[model samples]
Target: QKPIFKEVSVHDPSIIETNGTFYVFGSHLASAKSNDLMQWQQLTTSVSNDNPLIPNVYEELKETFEWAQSDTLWAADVTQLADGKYYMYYNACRGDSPRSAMGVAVADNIEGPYKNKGIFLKSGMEGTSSDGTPYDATKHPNVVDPHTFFDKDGKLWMVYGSYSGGIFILEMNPKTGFPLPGQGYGKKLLGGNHSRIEGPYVLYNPDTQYYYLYLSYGGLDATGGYNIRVARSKKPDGPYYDAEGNPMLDVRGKGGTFFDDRSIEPYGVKLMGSYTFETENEKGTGYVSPGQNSAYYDEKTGRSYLIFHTRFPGRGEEHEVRVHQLFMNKDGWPVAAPYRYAGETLKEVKQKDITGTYKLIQHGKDISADIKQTINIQLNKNHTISGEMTGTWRKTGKNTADITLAGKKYNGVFLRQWDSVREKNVMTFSVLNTSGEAVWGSK
Candidate 1:
C-alpha cells in the first residue's frame, strides 16, 4: 500500500539529516523537517520578520543583497561540519544578469538564527576575477546553488555554479567552512556558454568508489523540460566522465545559439525527464519539470535518497518536493526508482514473483517538453520478454536483473514499491545500459 506522505512547500530542497531528523533547506529561504522522508513540516519560508532559520536574513546578508542588488536568496544548503555547527551555504543573484554572490552562515543548531559569515565568492564582477585576471561571465561561474560535501578522504568540498560559465568545485577548509587558499573559482567540471545547467550536487558512493555529480538541466518551469542527469569521477574534484566515456567538460551550448542546450544534451547520463506510467483503467502518475536535486546517503543502512522539487503536468508554476530511492546498478551507475520512496527494501526476488505483464517507460536522452508515456511488455517465467518490444531477462543476483533489448543490455535492480497512482504496491525495476540511458517498469 502507498504510505501517506504529508507534504510541505520547499523549493530546491537540499537534503540533510542530523540527529535522526531529515531536513531540507531550500530556495527563497524555505526550510522543512521530517521524521520519515515522506512527511515534511515547514520550519521557515520567505525572507521576512518571522524567518527562524535566519531571523534577520536581510540585515545579516546586507552586503550580499547590496552586491547582488536583491533581497531574496536562492537555493541554500545546511551541513553539520566537523565542528558540530551547521554551516549554511547561501547565495543571491541579480534576476536579469549572471551577477551573483555565495556566502556562508553559522548556526549552533540545525534550526537556528544563523549568523552570516559573509560572502566567500562573487561573479559577474566589473574589473578582474578573484584570480586577478580579466573577469569573463562566459568563462566564470555564477556562484549560486551551493552544495558542500565531504569526499571519501574526508576532504571537504563545495560544488557551486549555474548557467553563466559552468559547474565548478572548490576545496574547502573543514574547520572554517571556507575555500582553501588560492584556487580561483576552482575547477570547471561541466557546462558552458549559457547551456541551462545548474544545481550542482556531489555525493561519493563507497561501493562504486566514484564521486557522483548530479545536475539539473533546462528551465525550472512546467513546460521547460527540466530534468536530472549525472556523471562520475574517481576523485571528488573531477575530470568527470559519463557512461558513454564523454568528457563532461565537452557538455555545453551550441555556437551561434544563446542558451542552446543541444550540444550538451547528449553528454551526461540522463536519469529521468517528464514521464508517466498509465494504469489499465485510469489516468496514470506523472511528473513535469523535475530538477534541482539533492541526494543523501545513509552510511549504516546503505540507502541513498534523491530529493528534488517538481512541477506537475499542466500545473503552471506550482511545485512540491519529491524523494525517490536511488540504487547503483551492477555497472556502478545510479538508477532512480519510478515512484516516490516508500520505505521499501530490495531483497531476493523469486523469478515467479517478478514475472508478469508490465508497463514500461524508456527515459530518453533529450531535453524535450514531451512526457514519455508507458508501453507494454511481458516478463515471462521462462526468462524472456515479449509484447510491445523484444527482449530477454534474467536474474543476476538476489534483486538485480540482466535485461537485453533492441541489441542493448541493461543492468538494474528489482523491488516492490508503492505506486501512488494505483494506490497499491507494485513490482518495479529501474535499469541503465552502458550508454547511461535508463528505463523504468512497473507490474
Candidate 2:
C-alpha cells in the first residue's frame, strides 16, 4: 500500500524507537511521535519556557517574531533521554537584533503538550573576535541548530553553528540538562564555513571511534545550496578533517559530483526523500551526500530505519518530512535500503521483518480488515521453495511451491526467513500476476 505522513519540513531530525513506537524531533516548532514510524502527527506544544534543551518556545517564539511577519524558529533537534522524557533543542530570538541562541523543550510523550525552557547558548553581544572578525548577533552571534549527541563516554554534546558563529560543541550535564559553563563552553571546530554553513549535526561510530560532523552549506533555498556534507575525526572536540584532510568546514559536495546528473543529493543518510539505499561509504574514504539525520534501529528485532526531511514540489517547507528503514553495509555505514519513490507520498522502506501478517490485533470502524497480498516482498528461505532463498521473498519460489499449500494469505499461511550469513531476512509475500502469467492459482 502507499505510505502515509508526507513532507513534515523538519530539519536535522533525531529518531528514537521505544517500546515499538517511533518518535521524531526536528527544526522549527514541530515534534512527531508515531507507533509505526509511518503515520505521524505533530505534538502541538513545546516542552518548556525557553529551555535550551526543549524545542518549542511558543511564547518567546511569538515574541521574537513580533516585528517580523512570521516565526523564525531555526534548526531544532531531539532525542529521547531519561524516563520516557524527550529533550528538544531549537534556535530562536526575542527581538529583531537577537543573538543566535539555543533553547530546549521537554515532553513526557513523543507527541504531547511540550513546555519550553529558556535560552541555553546565549552569546548576546556583537563585537570583533580576537582576530578582528566581527561577531554580529543579527548577522551572526552564538549558535543555531542544537544537534545533540550522547557519546560513548556518557558525555552529552550538542553541535551547532550559524553564518557568523562558527560551529561549536557544548558539554551538557546530563543530570541538570544544562551546559557545564566553564567546561561546557563552545569549541569553535570550524571557522564558520564563511560560505553560509548551517545545520551542524553530530554522530559517532563505536566500531571505528569516528566522530562525524555534518553540515549543510550554501543555505537551504533553491540556489540556497543547502546540500549536506560531512567530516570525521578521531576526537570529539578537534582535529576534524574531510576525506582529503582539509580542515572540516565551508565545503561543497565536490561541486557537480552528482552521480545522477547533478541532482543535488548531499546528505549521507539511510533514508532520503522516501527512498533508502545500503552503502559502504562508512569507511569515511568518500563522504556521503544523501539527506540529513540519523537512522532508527529497533533493539528487540535489531531492525533499523531512517527519518529525514526534504523540500519537494507542491509542499512548502512544512510537508517534506520522510521516514524509511535503514540498512548498512558490512562496514556499518547507514543508508536507505532500495526504495520505490512516490514523489510526495511519504512512503518508507518496509522493514525486512515487517512482511507477514499473522492476524489483526484489532480492526475497528470497519466490518473487516484482513492482511492482503503484499507488493512489499522480502528475500528469504522460509518464504521460498528451498532454504537457498534465505530471508528474501522470491517470485519463482512461490510459483512451484504449492500455491494451495501456500494456501492462506497472511493468517496462518505466511512465513518469515532470513539469510543468517548476510544477516538479512524476508517474509513471504505473493504477487498476483507476473508477465501476464497467473502462476499462483489464487490470483
Candidate 3:
C-alpha cells in the first residue's frame, strides 16, 4: 500500500486516449485498465492472442516468440492516428536469438482485441538489420518497452529498445501501424558502455518549449535498482542531451539521474510513483523504476502518471507496476514529489455561511469534555487562512464553499446549508476520502 500503484511487471508501457477513456497496454494482453490518468483498474484481459509488446530481451526471448504465438499479445505501443484507426506497435520473440522483430496490431478502440496483420518490422534492413542479422527486435520478448507519439502535424513516431543494441526510433505511417519501409528504419537513440538504458518515453510541453525524453539507467535491484531520468530537446529527435551535456540515459552521478530518488530519508522522492514510493515496507521506501506504460492527462486532473515495474529490496522477483504522479515544474522539467503518505489531500475552502460553533460528537458517545479544541471556521475568499488549520480550499460558487475535515487538517469542505428563511446555518463538513465518515468535529 505504498503511495503509488500496485498488482500489475507492466513492461513496455504506453497510453492511448480514445472516446474519453484512457486505455493502457503493456507486456501481456491481460494488462488493460480504466483510469482517470492518475489511477487505474482492469477492464478486460481477453485478446486475439497475437503477439503483444515487452521491454526485456535477455535469454528468455527465443522460447517466448514464434509466429504461432504471433496472435499472442506481447510488448506493444499504442497511439491514435490522424485517420482515426488506433495504431498498436508491438514486438514478438521466443528466446534470445534470430527471428525476433517488431510488428503492428490494429484496432478501432484503445483497449482492444486488436487484429494482427502480419509483420510490421522485419528482422533487420529490409527484413533484418544493416550488419547482417534479421531484426531480432526485442532481445527479451517480455521486456521491450515501446512508446508512440504524434506531432502537431500528425506525424507518427515510435521509440523502443532493449539489451541487444540499445534503443531505436522508427517513423510510423500515420494511417497504418506499420513503419514507413526505408522511412521506417529506426535510428539509435540512446545507449553506451555499462548503460542498459531502455524504456524510452517522449513528452512534449508547449508552454515550456521542451520535449521530455524519459528512460531508465539502473538495474532492477536495490543496489542498482531501477530509476527514471529525463532530458529536454526543442525537437522530437536529434542533438539531445541532459543539462550536463551527458547522454540522455545516464546514472553515474551520486544522486543518480533526473528520475532517481537518492534521498537521505528512508522514503525517497523525486520520481513520482504510487506503490514504489508509498510502500509501507521500510525497504521499499523510494523504489521507482517505471516501465510498461503511462496515462493521458485528464483536464479535470491537470496531470499524468507513469506506471512501471519494481522489485522490493531483497525480494527475488515478484514485480509490480508502481504508479506515480508526473509533475512538470514551471520550467517545464518533469518533477515528482518525494515519497510520503500516499493520498491526494483535496483542499476545500470554508464558507462564510459557516460562522458559528456547534457541539462535537464521536461514535454516539458524548465526549464534550474532550472536545476542547474550538472549531472556528470563518472563510473569506481573498484573505488567507494561516496557522495549523490552513490551506487553499475549493469554492463551489461565488457565494458558497464546501468545508472539509480530512484527518487533522482543519480548513475542511463547508457545505451550503440553508433554512426556510434561506439563511445559511448549521455548517457541516465531512471527510472526502471515505464514505462521509465523521470523526473529531466542531459545531
Candidate 4:
C-alpha cells in the first residue's frame, strides 16, 4: 500500500529508536515519532512553558537562556543509554554568535518531561579555557548541535559543535552518560575557524567497520546552501577522512573567514544537496537546504535510513522532517535514496525491469544555493545509458549498480521506493564516486 504521510516540522532532526518506536527530536524543541517511518505523530513543538517534553523548559534552562541571551533551543538529541534511561543532549544558542550551552536531561520515558540535569558545557566565553588559557573561538567549539552514539566497543561518545570552532568529540562513561574526566572539550574532528560546518553526527557501520561522520556544511535555512556530507574513520574519535582521503581536520574555513565556504566547500564527501526532479505532473518537486541529519540502521531488516529536515522548492523558511533509505556502495561510502523511504525493500532487478527513462541529478561537490535540475536519460535494455549524456552500465550485486557516465564511475543501487509526490512506488538510483560526487535518478 502507498503510505500517506503527513508533514511534521522538526528542523535539525536527531533520530533514535526506543522500545519499538522511532522518534526524532529537533530544534525549537519539536519532536515526532513513527512506528513504520511513514506516518509520523508529532509529539511536541517549540520551547515554551507547556512543551510536553520539557514543560517548564524556560524556567529550568534559565541559565542557558541568560547566557545565550536567546529564548529558543537550537538542536536537541535524544539517546537511550545502557542504564535504560533516556538522555537528551540539548543545546540553546544566541543566533549570529557562538554563545551557546550544551546540557543533558534525563527521562524515564522516551516522550519525557525530561528532568533537567543542568548545563555541563558552555561556549563563546570571553576568557578562561578549561586549561586556564584565554578562550579562543577559533580553536574552541561553539557548544551546539550535539549527537551522541555508542561505538562498536559499547563506549558512549558525543560529537558536537558548529561554525565557531568546528566539531569536537568526547568519550563518555557509558554508565553515567557523561564525558570522561579531565578531557575538557575532547578533540576536534572537523571544521573550525568559524567554518560553515555544523550538526555533527557519527554512526558505526559494523559491516564496513567504519565510523561514518555525518555533517552539514553551510547554513540551516532555505537559501543557506545547506547540504549533507560525510567522512569516515576506523576509530570512534577520529582523524576522519573523506572519500578522496582528505583529512576532516583539514576541512575548515580560513582563519579570518566567518560563515563563508572559503576553501571548506571542497573537502568533505558531499552526499545530498539541493536538487529537483521536475516532472510533468509534479512541478518544483525537490528539496532545498536538506541538512542536519541523524541516521539509523535496523539490523532486523539489514537496511539503513537517513533522517533530516528539509525545505521544499518554493517553501520559504518552513521546513519538515524527511527520511530516505541509505545504502553503502561497494567502496564503503553512504548514498541516499532519491525519495522518502516508505515500508519498501530493495529487490533484485531483471534486465527488463531495469530499463527505463529517468530524470537524473548529479550532486556536485560544492556548497550551492541553486538546485541541481535533473536531465532526461534512457537506461536501454542493451546495458547502455543514452540521453543528453552517453554511458555504459552494468548491474553488480542483486540490486547494486555500477554506472559509468561521461568517463566517471558511479556506484549505488536500484530500488523501488515510494514516490511521495506521485503517491506510488518508482524505480530510482543513487550513486556516488570516489571523488565525493553523487548521482541520483528517479522515474
Q: For this target, which candidate reaches the highest lDDT against the unseen true structure?
A: 1
Better of 1 and 3 by lDDT: 1
Query: What tens-digit string does per-residue lDDT give for candidate 2 at 1-443?
Result: 33443334355566766567666666555556667565666653233544343344446455333322235565567666655577767566443333545667666765544566555555444454322455543223345667777877888877776544456777886865667766433667764223345566666766456776755544443323244445667777766765435565332223322112122122122111111111233110011122455554454555545455555322334334555443322233333322212222212324343333321111111111121121222233354332211222323222212221233211112223322223333332212111111111110
1-443 per-residue lDDT for model 4 (tens digits) = 45778778888999998889999999888999998887899888878898989878888888889989998998999999977999998888888788888888889999987888878888878888654567788888889999999898878899999888789999987887777888887888977788889998998999999999999988878889999999999999988999889988877777777776858888888999999887556653589999999999998888999999998887798888999889999999998988888777778877677788988898898898998988889999889999988898788879999998888888989887777776666888889988999999886
Off by over 4 Å in 1: none
Clashes of each: 0, 60, 77, 1
Residue pairs that clash (backbone atoms under 3 angstroms), model 4: 166-191
Predicted structure 1: clash tally: 0
Encode model 1's per-residue lDDT on 1-443: one tens digit a residue.
Answer: 34888878899999998999999999899999998998889888798757888876788889888889987899999988998999999999997987888899999989987999879898878988876687777778888999999888889999988897889999999999999989999988987787899998999998889999999989888778899999999899998999988999878887556688677888888898998886557566789988999999998799999999998766778888899999999889999998898888887788888889888999889988888888889999888899988889998879997898788999888888888767887888899999888999898
Residue 307: error of model 4 in Å?
Answer: 0.3
Worst 10 residues of 2 by lDDT: 434-443
Provide TM-scores for the models: 0.97, 0.57, 0.59, 0.97
Better of 2 and 4 by TM-score: 4
lDDT of each: 0.88, 0.44, 0.45, 0.87
Q: What does candidate 3 score on TM?
A: 0.59
